Amino acid sequence: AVADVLEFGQSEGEPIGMAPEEWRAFAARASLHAARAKAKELGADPPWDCELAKTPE
Amino acid sequence: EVPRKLLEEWLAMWSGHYQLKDKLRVQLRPQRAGSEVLELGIHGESDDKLANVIFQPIQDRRGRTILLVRDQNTFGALRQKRLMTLIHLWLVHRFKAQAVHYVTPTDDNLYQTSKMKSHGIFTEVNQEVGEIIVAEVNHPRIAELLTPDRVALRKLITK
Amino acid sequence: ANVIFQPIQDRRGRTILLVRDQNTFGAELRQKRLMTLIHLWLVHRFKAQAVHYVTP
Structure with missing residues (x-):
């Protein structure tokens, strides 16, 4: 979700806070808390909700 | 997007x-x-x-x-x-705006908001306390203009 | 006031x-x-970071 926002910023010619590959490397080893905090620093705060997608159980 | x-x-x-x-x-x-x-x-x-x-x-x-x-x-x-x-x-599409407020009620701002009301961008335009213009977005009209066929939009552009 | x-x-x-x-x-x-x-x-009540005045 954050990658999509960063790619859009790049396509729009806005200045890169971090490269796509750099974000992916960070996200891969980040808690949700840490990923959200970092995204917020980069001005990327996409709507994302894992609660909505939970099964009936 | x-x-x-x-x-x-x-x-x-x-x-x-x-x-x-x-x-x-x-x-x-x-x-x-x-x-x-x-x-x-x-x-x-x-x-x-x-x-x-x-x-x-x-x-x-x-x-x-x-x-x-x-x-x-x-x-x-x-x-x-x-x-x-x-x-x-x-701008209204980009920021998914519900309203636009104009800080200074200049002659141009009154003129422009009136014009955009006639184009259907705004449902209502009102000068409020503090002398700010509050313009409420006409969501159905925005949706009409953003239709991919661009029929309504071309009509707006070409009069 | x-x-x-x-x-x-x-x-x-x-x-x-x-x-x-x-x-x-x-x-008086x-x-x-x-x-x-x-x-x-007001700043305490609303935990405000800033105040903007519309007309200078």
Whole structure:
């Protein structure tokens, strides 16, 4: 979700806070808390909700 | 999923209709370094600023997005051709705005908001306490204009 | 005295008070920091980061 926002910023010619590959490397080893905090620093705060997608159980 | 290029495409339709050759480019950046106030600029091939909107997107208590407009101008004597309406259509779509507030009730702002009401961008326009113009977005009309077939939009651009 | 204002949030989630109007109506009450006390309370009440005045 954050990658999509960063790619859009790049396509729009806005200045890169971090490269796509750099974000992916960070996200891969980040808690949700840490990923959200970092995204917020980069001005990327996409709507994302894992609660909505939970099964009936 | 609302790129600057979308407004550039609309302005190409516009330039085409009015037989103006100058390729109009769209710029959206902080009005100055590190600011939450933004400037939408329309630039020609010479990079001259032909129109602008200076504004800050904010949220009210109910979480509704409002664009606080500090200033808007059609600089190039481009006037009387609905350019500012196109810019507002794009801004309202880009920021999913519920309303636009104008900080100073200048003659131009009253004129422009009245014009955009007639184009259907706004349902209501009212000067409120503090002498600010509050313009409520006509969501059905915005949706109509953004239809991919561009029929309603072309009609707006070409009169 | 009065303050007419709307509390709003910027992109960063910071609270700003948008002040449309402020007045110290009573002449006896002026030059005594009344409006300062009101603003102290408003800033505390709404946990404001900034105050914007619409008309200079």
